[PDB]
Design a protein around this ligand. Structure first.
Ligand SMILES: CCCCCCCCCCCCCCCCCC(=O)OC[C@H](COP(=O)(O)OCCN)OC(=O)CCCCCCCCCCCCCCCCC
Lengths: 48, 48, 48, 96
């Protein structure tokens, strides 16, 4: 119960950062490189 | 003829072919029956 | 290949687990980067 | 290794050497093995029968011994159609 104020703070900080990243990064990570004319994603040895 | 025997209708998926991965080719024989090399009567069946 | 005399030559790796898209790699007997061969190495491994 | 001379021929539309036999080892079978090297040692006495067969019937095509270790020793010698790393197409031929 002493942790009722740290929880109420972590919660409202995660919410603020979620709303900020929902505004600056929404929909920007849907492009990637494929091999030309295929649906195979083109990566390297230990790249993800 | 020196060509392979075909089975079915040939269909590939062009959106799932890496450019440089060395597809396998073939190992089958040219097994052409006698009644599939000529037009077939009832007399050719009994000759065969 | 389980012993070092066997782990020689080339072998096939299959891209995205597709048996019809293979490529050649030389096979080599590799040592883990963090191992337990001496005490200094074991102390490094356990530090990490 | 042996480096052959490879005259050109008819009845084989490729460059062929009647001096020795060629050996095919599958790509993922290390030659250098003790199984493989004990095979290339006793199959070396085949080349004389290969040569005699071809000397008695000059109209002969390939003569091959396919081994249960994966080897294929054929006569006359002739470079394989596909090398595994020379170009980019890996050859997948196993006698078995
Ligand atoms: C009972 C005995 C009593 C004597 C105790 C003496 C005091 C020791 C206190 C230091 C603590 C050491 C613990 C760290 C783990 C040891 C790491 C190690 O030993 O790595 C050795 C490393 C071998 O790695 P390997 O994979 O074999 O490499 C192969 C290719 N070279 O090869 C290397 O080159 C690794 C180099 C090691 C660098 C260590 C530097 C540490 C300095 C610490 C200063 C910061 C700490 C400040 C205080 C911390 C909190 C108080």
């Amino acid at each position: 119960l002493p942790l009722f104020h740290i929880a109420l703070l972590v919660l409202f900080m995660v919410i603020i950062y979620a709303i900020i990243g929902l505004e600056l990064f929404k929909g920007k990570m849907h492009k990637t490189c494929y091999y030309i004319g295929t649906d195979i994603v083109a990566t390297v040895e230990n790249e993800k | 003829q020196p060509k392979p025997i075909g089975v079915g209708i040939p269909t590939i998926n062009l959106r799932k072919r890496r450019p440089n991965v060395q597809n396998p080719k073939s190992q089958e024989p040219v097994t052409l029956d006698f009644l599939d090399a000529e037009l077939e009567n009832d007399i050719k069946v009994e000759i065969r | 290949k389980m012993t070092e005399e066997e782990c020689r030559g080339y072998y096939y790796v299959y891209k995205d687990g597709d048996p019809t898209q293979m490529e050649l790699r030389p096979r080599q007997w590799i040592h883990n980067d963090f191992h337990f061969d001496n005490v200094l190495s074991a102390m490094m491994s356990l530090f990490t | 290794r042996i480096k052959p001379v490879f005259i050109d021929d008819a009845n084989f539309r490729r460059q062929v050497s009647y001096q020795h036999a060629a050996v095919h080892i599958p790509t993922d079978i290390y030659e250098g093995s003790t199984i493989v090297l004990n095979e290339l040692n006793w199959t070396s006495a085949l080349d004389d029968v290969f040569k005699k067969n071809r000397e008695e019937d000059p109209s002969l095509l390939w003569q091959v011994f396919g081994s249960a270790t994966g080897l294929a020793r054929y006569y006359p010698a002739s470079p394989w159609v596909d090398n595994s790393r020379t170009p980019n197409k890996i050859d997948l031929y196993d006698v078995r």
